[PDB]
């Protein structure tokens, strides 16, 4: 029983929505804790990203497009979760005398059943959207890996741990061309096959 | 010599926030959102 501009009452004691991805201090798509064994704690400017390592230095960088798409999706998911449950049942006080215990029991079971229905709805929506959020993050990491893998093709050897070692001298402009998706295949393919022959 | 490498990874932190799913209970996530007021 409440009065005023109030949140919606549920009988749950914990109701936490996952917005961030799975924590790896030390899924359906198999990228987060899959072939990529753990997350990067040095990469703070994004949810997903890159760790280039060449002769000009090594460092982290975020994929801002996929991170912004994921943040837009998570924000819209949270707004939708709030929006769909704005029409929740609001229990109000009813009083009955001792010769009206049957209508009193009817009102009590009606309000208790509505509170149980909306508690089930809130808990199940939190659980289902937590699975959808974690699988969405896993799909985003898998799609970023697929994007880089289909950009580089056979100009880079995938090492099976989420990393690609290049068959050509890929400098910082080359790395940022990988990062924006503007990698150019035929500029590096001949030296890539030359290095493949020389390490065969 | 050392060949040029690029990797794809994801964000991690020192967070201990836990969320529950249907198939896994109390999953530690990087960022979580309490939507319930207990106080």
């Amino acid at each position, epitope marked *: 029983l409440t009065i005023g501009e109030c949140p919606k009452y549920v009988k749950s004691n914990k109701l936490v929505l996952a917005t961030g991805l799975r924590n790896s201090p030390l899924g359906l798509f198999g990228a987060i804790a899959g072939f990529i064994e753990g997350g990067w704690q040095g990469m703070v400017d994004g949810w997903y990203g890159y760790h280039h390592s060449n002769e000009q230095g090594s460092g982290y960088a975020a994929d*801002k497009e996929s991170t912004q798409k994921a943040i*837009d999706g998570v924000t819209n998911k949270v707004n939708s979760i709030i929006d769909k449950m704005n029409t929740q049942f609001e229990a109000v006080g009813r009083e009955f005398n001792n010769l009206e215990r049957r209508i009193e029991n009817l009102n009590k079971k009606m309000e208790d059943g509505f509170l149980d229905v909306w508690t089930y709805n809130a808990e199940l929506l939190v659980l289902m959207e937590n699975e959808r959020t974690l699988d969405f993050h896993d799909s985003n990491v898998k799609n970023l890996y697929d994007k880089v893998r289909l950009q580089l093709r056979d100009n880079a050897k995938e090492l099976g741990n989420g990393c690609f070692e290049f068959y050509h001298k890929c400098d910082n402009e080359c790395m940022e061309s990988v990062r924006n998706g503007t990698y150019d295949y035929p500029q590096y393919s001949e030296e890539a096959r030359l290095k493949r022959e020389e390490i065969s | 010599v050392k060949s040029d490498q690029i990797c794809i990874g994801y964000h991690a932190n020192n967070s201990t926030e836990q969320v529950d799913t249907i198939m896994e209970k109390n999953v530690t996530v990087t960022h979580a959102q309490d939507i319930l007021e207990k106080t």
Partner: antibody
Amino acid sequence: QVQLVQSGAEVKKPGSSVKVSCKSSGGTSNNYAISWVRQAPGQGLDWMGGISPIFGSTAYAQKFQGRVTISADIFSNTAYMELNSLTSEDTAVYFCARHGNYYYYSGMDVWGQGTTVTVS
Amino acid sequence: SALTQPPAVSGTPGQRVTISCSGSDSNIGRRSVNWYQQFPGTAPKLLIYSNDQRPSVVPDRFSGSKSGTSASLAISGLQSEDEAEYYCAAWDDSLKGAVFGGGTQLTVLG
């Protein structure tokens, strides 16, 4: 369109604290980083910090670290800035500014109207 | 601080004027520089982002350029409405935060 609406001007004594809000009106701002930029009278702009609430990042300036508290509310679309231990050097005009993406590298394209804090 | 601007620039209407922004390796040389235009008593406006990109509301006479650890903002064909304070801003990797220039007050002569 999204307009950032701040709180009114504040008159404070030294040793107190001031809390300034920045309500995002006309649309949400939870998927963008909202920075807090102050401007001393006769001086230039100075970054205090910012919060990226859905992304989960709360950054602070090194010259403001431990003294300013910046929080965000994603259900009221409001970003807050609390500055403690006010002195006369904290007299400035305080702006909330929404970035172009989730983080702080992008340009601040949406700004609040400003909040003048005078400490005396 | 950490970004150096000339405190004042001047020019006639129709004259091309340039505003420089000198930084270091960790702020301008490795991050993008944003330019802000602020009239007295009003909020700043985004003018140039990504070093050379422009918002659709900003007129095409404003342009920016970055070379090394320095940045430049060019206003070709100056007008009367361009009298404002101009700030350059970029993320600083050493301070782990955003830094601003000292501010450049543009005076329209005449």
